[PDB]
Write a protein that holds these residues in place. Structure first.
Motif, mmCIF file in Angstrom:
data_model
loop_
_atom_site.group_PDB
_atom_site.id
_atom_site.type_symbol
_atom_site.label_atom_id
_atom_site.label_comp_id
_atom_site.label_asym_id
_atom_site.label_seq_id
_atom_site.Cartn_x
_atom_site.Cartn_y
_atom_site.Cartn_z
ATOM 1 N N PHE A 195 1.220 3.517 -104.846
ATOM 2 C CA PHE A 195 2.281 4.290 -105.493
ATOM 3 C C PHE A 195 2.453 3.890 -106.956
ATOM 4 O O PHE A 195 2.784 4.729 -107.797
ATOM 5 C CB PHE A 195 3.608 4.149 -104.753
ATOM 6 C CG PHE A 195 4.714 4.990 -105.354
ATOM 7 C CD1 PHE A 195 4.800 6.354 -105.083
ATOM 8 C CD2 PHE A 195 5.664 4.423 -106.204
ATOM 9 C CE1 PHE A 195 5.818 7.146 -105.653
ATOM 10 C CE2 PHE A 195 6.693 5.209 -106.768
ATOM 11 C CZ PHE A 195 6.764 6.568 -106.484
ATOM 12 N N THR A 196 2.217 2.614 -107.278
ATOM 13 C CA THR A 196 2.287 2.157 -108.662
ATOM 14 C C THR A 196 1.259 2.878 -109.531
ATOM 15 O O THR A 196 1.564 3.322 -110.649
ATOM 16 C CB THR A 196 2.085 0.636 -108.717
ATOM 17 O OG1 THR A 196 3.133 -0.006 -107.982
ATOM 18 C CG2 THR A 196 2.118 0.116 -110.155
ATOM 19 N N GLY A 203 2.460 8.610 -116.381
ATOM 20 C CA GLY A 203 2.961 8.233 -117.687
ATOM 21 C C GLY A 203 3.859 7.015 -117.700
ATOM 22 O O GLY A 203 4.109 6.465 -118.781
ATOM 23 N N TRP A 204 4.353 6.572 -116.544
ATOM 24 C CA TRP A 204 5.158 5.359 -116.497
ATOM 25 C C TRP A 204 4.428 4.202 -117.170
ATOM 26 O O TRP A 204 3.242 3.970 -116.932
ATOM 27 C CB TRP A 204 5.498 4.994 -115.047
ATOM 28 C CG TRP A 204 6.437 3.829 -114.942
ATOM 29 C CD1 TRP A 204 7.686 3.752 -115.462
ATOM 30 C CD2 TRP A 204 6.206 2.580 -114.263
ATOM 31 N NE1 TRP A 204 8.254 2.538 -115.165
ATOM 32 C CE2 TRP A 204 7.366 1.797 -114.431
ATOM 33 C CE3 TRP A 204 5.135 2.050 -113.532
ATOM 34 C CZ2 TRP A 204 7.489 0.507 -113.902
ATOM 35 C CZ3 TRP A 204 5.260 0.762 -113.001
ATOM 36 C CH2 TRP A 204 6.430 0.011 -113.189
ATOM 37 N N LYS A 205 5.142 3.487 -118.031
ATOM 38 C CA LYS A 205 4.599 2.344 -118.750
ATOM 39 C C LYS A 205 4.984 1.078 -118.001
ATOM 40 O O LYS A 205 6.127 0.621 -118.125
ATOM 41 C CB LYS A 205 5.136 2.309 -120.186
ATOM 42 C CG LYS A 205 4.827 3.548 -121.019
ATOM 43 C CD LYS A 205 5.633 3.549 -122.310
ATOM 44 C CE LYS A 205 5.394 4.801 -123.120
ATOM 45 N NZ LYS A 205 4.080 4.766 -123.800
ATOM 46 N N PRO A 206 4.076 0.463 -117.241
ATOM 47 C CA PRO A 206 4.460 -0.656 -116.368
ATOM 48 C C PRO A 206 4.667 -1.931 -117.163
ATOM 49 O O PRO A 206 3.819 -2.310 -117.988
ATOM 50 C CB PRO A 206 3.257 -0.787 -115.426
ATOM 51 C CG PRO A 206 2.108 -0.395 -116.269
ATOM 52 C CD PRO A 206 2.614 0.669 -117.239
ATOM 53 N N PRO A 207 5.787 -2.619 -116.946
ATOM 54 C CA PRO A 207 5.992 -3.919 -117.606
ATOM 55 C C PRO A 207 4.952 -4.955 -117.217
ATOM 56 O O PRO A 207 4.744 -5.917 -117.967
ATOM 57 C CB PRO A 207 7.393 -4.332 -117.137
ATOM 58 C CG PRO A 207 8.048 -3.044 -116.720
ATOM 59 C CD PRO A 207 6.956 -2.194 -116.166
ATOM 60 N N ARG A 208 4.288 -4.775 -116.073
ATOM 61 C CA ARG A 208 3.326 -5.739 -115.543
ATOM 62 C C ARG A 208 3.961 -7.117 -115.394
ATOM 63 O O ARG A 208 3.379 -8.141 -115.756
ATOM 64 C CB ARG A 208 2.058 -5.785 -116.394
ATOM 65 C CG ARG A 208 1.395 -4.421 -116.517
ATOM 66 C CD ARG A 208 -0.101 -4.512 -116.772
ATOM 67 N NE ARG A 208 -0.868 -4.165 -115.577
ATOM 68 C CZ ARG A 208 -1.334 -2.947 -115.304
ATOM 69 N NH1 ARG A 208 -1.128 -1.943 -116.153
ATOM 70 N NH2 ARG A 208 -2.018 -2.737 -114.183
ATOM 71 N N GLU A 226 8.786 14.266 -111.553
ATOM 72 C CA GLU A 226 9.144 13.729 -112.862
ATOM 73 C C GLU A 226 9.601 12.275 -112.748
ATOM 74 O O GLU A 226 10.177 11.855 -111.739
ATOM 75 C CB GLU A 226 10.250 14.585 -113.534
ATOM 76 C CG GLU A 226 9.891 16.057 -113.674
ATOM 77 C CD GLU A 226 11.043 16.917 -114.159
ATOM 78 O OE1 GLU A 226 11.926 16.409 -114.894
ATOM 79 O OE2 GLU A 226 11.058 18.112 -113.789
ATOM 80 N N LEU A 227 9.349 11.515 -113.806
ATOM 81 C CA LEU A 227 9.663 10.095 -113.845
ATOM 82 C C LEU A 227 11.070 9.867 -114.386
ATOM 83 O O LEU A 227 11.493 10.514 -115.348
ATOM 84 C CB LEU A 227 8.631 9.362 -114.706
ATOM 85 C CG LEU A 227 7.281 9.279 -114.000
ATOM 86 C CD1 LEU A 227 6.198 8.776 -114.931
ATOM 87 C CD2 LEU A 227 7.416 8.356 -112.814
ATOM 88 N N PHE A 228 11.797 8.950 -113.744
ATOM 89 C CA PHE A 228 13.132 8.545 -114.158
ATOM 90 C C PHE A 228 13.291 7.064 -113.880
ATOM 91 O O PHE A 228 12.894 6.591 -112.811
ATOM 92 C CB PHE A 228 14.237 9.280 -113.405
ATOM 93 C CG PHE A 228 14.170 10.772 -113.499
ATOM 94 C CD1 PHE A 228 13.460 11.501 -112.562
ATOM 95 C CD2 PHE A 228 14.852 11.450 -114.496
ATOM 96 C CE1 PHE A 228 13.388 12.874 -112.635
ATOM 97 C CE2 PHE A 228 14.800 12.824 -114.551
ATOM 98 C CZ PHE A 228 14.066 13.538 -113.619
ATOM 99 N N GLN A 229 13.891 6.339 -114.817
ATOM 100 C CA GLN A 229 14.107 4.909 -114.656
ATOM 101 C C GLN A 229 15.509 4.697 -114.111
ATOM 102 O O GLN A 229 16.487 5.047 -114.782
ATOM 103 C CB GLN A 229 13.930 4.175 -115.987
ATOM 104 C CG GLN A 229 14.087 2.654 -115.869
ATOM 105 C CD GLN A 229 14.666 1.996 -117.119
ATOM 106 O OE1 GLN A 229 15.120 2.667 -118.045
ATOM 107 N NE2 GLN A 229 14.661 0.672 -117.137
ATOM 108 N N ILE A 230 15.615 4.151 -112.900
ATOM 109 C CA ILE A 230 16.958 3.816 -112.405
ATOM 110 C C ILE A 230 17.600 2.836 -113.369
ATOM 111 O O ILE A 230 16.924 1.905 -113.844
ATOM 112 C CB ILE A 230 16.911 3.212 -111.000
ATOM 113 C CG1 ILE A 230 16.284 4.163 -109.991
ATOM 114 C CG2 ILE A 230 18.315 2.852 -110.536
ATOM 115 C CD1 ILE A 230 16.108 3.495 -108.641
ATOM 116 N N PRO A 231 18.865 3.010 -113.726
ATOM 117 C CA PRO A 231 19.505 2.061 -114.629
ATOM 118 C C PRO A 231 19.563 0.691 -113.988
ATOM 119 O O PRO A 231 20.058 0.556 -112.863
ATOM 120 C CB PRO A 231 20.907 2.652 -114.821
ATOM 121 C CG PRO A 231 20.720 4.089 -114.566
ATOM 122 C CD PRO A 231 19.723 4.170 -113.457
#
Ligand code: HEM
Ligand code: HEM
Ligand code: V5D
Ligand code: V5D
Ligand code: ZN
Lengths: 413, 420
Positions: A195-196, A203-208, A226-231
């Motif tokens: 899933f990662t 397009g998600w930019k992974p912090p790694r 669509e991508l969304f970052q949970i706060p």
């Protein structure tokens, strides 16, 4: 006809009638049992109405109104919608009743003593992924309740033609990322590597890092997800320390407080709710922090066993068993210290037996998947292990459904 | 349907099962209900309650003899057709038939092979069969069983064995071992309500005392043998102690552990099951192998009259027993299981931990799918009673189905026995 289940520890015998009202397959045949098979196996008008009649009948039964003028008008009103639009819409009362009873009917769930106290969030007006992000964020904030966790479900619009499905592509709302490394090692959660990669590709930019909360991948009305970052302020987390081993904190471990399944399908009266994330709280043993990798070679199990100076040569030392207990002690102590709700596998199984007996008394039975009710460790010293259990599929139900990236036909070029 | 796949969700290995297509009797499940966790889900016997007509027994006899001659790549041969005619005449004239020694050995081993609940079946074809069908009294049974125990114990190098007493005729002349296992510890009900000894064996212990047995009322009292021959009243016999190999349980790190004065016996030998071959019912068929460490129920054992060995061990470990979330049962349970393996190995008495045993069973499953087309297996019983998810069988799917020859359950004889 009346079936009996015995408890070989207490001698209690319960009489099951509810099983007469099941309808779809277990997967087992008269000559083969599939009890240990994980998954064993769009509606037309003619399929849909008997199912709607079934659900409505049972809802009006449940409110002591079967055959009433309100019952018959509802049945007629449903028939008209199905005749006109090849589908129908649940009243709010029916949506709540149905979501609550899908949990009540979930035979693989040990935590059902709480089923009647489910908070239902009606999200059937949602039209966009942003709206899904809004609904899901409010779910998380409410369920988390600053660590005093509360069961909730959020129900997005039902299936129509199968080509305008709402889906949460995450398997849970909060999971940690997994990255496979060139050298074959894994960073983060190995359970989530696939899933990662989907997210990174979207397009998600992974912090790694090691505990990267994955982004939400949300799909409305059959459009591309669509991508969304949970706060981050909404993701409650518990650093894992052991009450006796001061070195345990130095493994650097934490887990998320809120378990929230988002990849299953809610079926009420023949309607399919392809996105219906629901959340409760953890039983201690569910938390898979065991499968992390501390260094480039060793599990958290192997690392915990290493730091305990265990003889990890032969299996018969039971080092794997020994370290498994300690990790579970640490998980439970850590959550309890931080006043985040959690239940140990002893407490949960005992309450399930009380719930099961009460369900046999008021309801005439309780379908239960022993293969899934028995905790993954210390099985025989918990009370469900000696409890006989009948498994059958009642509806409403939660069902598995295909992973959306295997069936989604991508919109944008 | 046609072929049923099973999947291991750790390795993704998929096996494809066709052997289930030779399943004879009902599991208890339906399309609509699953009884996978019922102890005895079905009563689907292959023959009526006792002495059956020819059209009831012969089809069963034919099927087994067919399968036996198929096993050795005859079938239709002179010996096979001659054997069917021999079974026919034999039923015509005695209402039953008698297995050949080859037939008896094949059926014993395949009843083990078919035991869907047994994790130890990697070893199924390495089984010593002791034919005791010439036996006529309880003394003779006592002699046969004594020799079984000596052979199987083998000074600690345990060997699997089965002793097979005369088949059931009319149901009134049954041979029965009234013990559930050949070696078991007594359970005494104390006048204050607590139990002394092994609480699992309280009823049978009272049945022995009622039959004239004098309880030593010590700690680990080996129960006498209660042996029933030809349907007569059963008789008590004391197994010679030199034939009962016992392992003192100590712990490799806890030196206080041996001061619990605990010990277990080395030889597990189920003696209350029924072996079924080609329609014949061998109601006395004690079989033995060696223990999986988790099976030794020393934890429920009560030396005191207040505390399990489980809660006792927890006291000596200084465990917070205030609430469950300390996992003190879990922690003590691991230590007790560490102690048991350590002692059996230290005394050179055969034993297997649950990791090796479950790993072995996966190897066995692969072989069985490779050669036989499948392997019947009961997940509820193959998964060990502790640490389930860290053994390889937890994540292995299984198909359960009933193959014959098999070991069946049977009523405790005292429910259905009228005394002479
Ligand atoms: C409130 C506390 C809850 C606890 C302690 C709990 C506990 C569990 C556990 C331990 C499992 C087995 C999963 C595993 O072992 O990996 C399970 C399964 C399940 N639970 Fe619960 N649960 C809770 C709440 C809920 C709620 C609120 C719902 C629905 C509204 C639900 C629906 C289910 C379903 C559908 C499954 C089956 C999952 C599957 O088949 O993959 N549970 N639960
Ligand atoms: C040689 C080493 C063996 C091992 C390690 C082993 C292991 C086991 C275990 C762990 C169980 C679960 C029962 C429980 O936990 O209460 C079991 C059941 C069983 N075993 Fe094996 N076994 C062995 C030999 C044998 C032999 C030689 C036979 C017969 C020829 C046999 C027949 C059975 C049967 C019929 C069951 C089902 C018992 C029931 O339905 O209650 N086993 N075995
Ligand atoms: N607190 C809470 C609150 C709400 C919901 C839940 C349940 C979360 C369930 C997440 N989806 C569980 C799952 C799905 C697929 C595979 C899994 O692992 C593989 C596996 C293989 C064989 C098994 C045999 C028996 C057994 N019992 N599990 C097995 C698991 C897990 N929890
Ligand atoms: N080395 C060896 C060698 C040969 C044979 C054996 C097996 C010894 C078996 C002795 N007969 C123990 C027994 C029989 C029936 C019930 C028992 O307890 C009750 C109970 C209830 C529910 C269960 C659910 C799952 C499960 N797995 N077990 C359950 C047991 C014990 N061992
Ligand atoms: Zn079944």
């Amino acid at each position: 006809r009346f079936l009996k289940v015995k408890n070989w520890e207490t001698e209690v015998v319960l009489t099951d009638t509810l099983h007469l009202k099941s309808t779809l397959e277990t997967g087992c045949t008269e000559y083969i049992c599939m009890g240990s098979i994980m998954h064993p196996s769009v509606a037309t008008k003619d399929q849909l109405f008997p199912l709607a009649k079934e659900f409505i009948d049972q809802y009006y039964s449940s409110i002591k109104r079967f055959g009433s003028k309100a019952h018959m008008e509802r049945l007629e009103e449903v028939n008209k919608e199905i005749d006109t639009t090849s589908t129908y819409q649940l009243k709010d009362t029916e949506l709540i009743y149905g979501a609550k009873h899908a949990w009540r009917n979930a035979s693989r769930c040990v935590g059902r003593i709480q089923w009647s106290k489910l908070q239902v969030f009606d999200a059937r007006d949602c039209t966009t992924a942003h709206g899904m992000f809004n609904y899901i964020c409010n779910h998380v904030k409410y369920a988390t309740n600053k660590g005093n966790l509360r069961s909730a479900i959020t129900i997005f619009p039902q299936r129509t033609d199968g080509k305008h499905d709402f889906r949460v592509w995450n398997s849970q709302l909060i999971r940690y990322a997994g990255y496979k490394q060139p050298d074959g090692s894994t960073l983060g959660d190995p359970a989530n590597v696939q899933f990662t990669e989907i997210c990174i590709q979207q397009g998600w930019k992974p912090p790694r890092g090691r505990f990267d909360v994955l982004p939400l991948l949300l799909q409305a009305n059959g459009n591309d997800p669509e991508l969304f970052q949970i706060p981050p302020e909404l993701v409650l987390e518990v650093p894992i320390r052991h009450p006796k081993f001061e070195w345990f904190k130095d493994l650097g471990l934490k887990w998320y407080g809120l378990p929230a399944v988002s990849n299953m399908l809610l079926e009420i009266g023949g309607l399919e709710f392809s996105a219906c994330p629901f959340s409760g709280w953890y039983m201690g043993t569910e938390i898979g922090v065991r499968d992390y990798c501390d260094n480039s070679r060793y599990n958290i199990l192997e690392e915990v066993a290493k730091k305990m100076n265990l003889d990890m040569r032969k299996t018969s030392s039971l080092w794997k068993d020994q370290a498994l207990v300690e990790i579970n002690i640490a998980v439970l102590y850590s959550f309890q210290s931080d006043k985040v709700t959690i239940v140990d596998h002893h407490s949960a199984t005992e309450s399930f037996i009380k719930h099961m007996e009460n369900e046999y008394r008021c309801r005439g039975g309780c379908p239960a998947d022993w293969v899934w009710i028995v905790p993954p460790m210390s099985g025989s010293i918990t009370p469900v292990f000696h409890q006989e259990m009948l498994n059958y599929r009642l509806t409403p139900s939660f069902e598995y459904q295909p992973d959306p990236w295997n069936t989604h036909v991508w919109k944008l070029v």
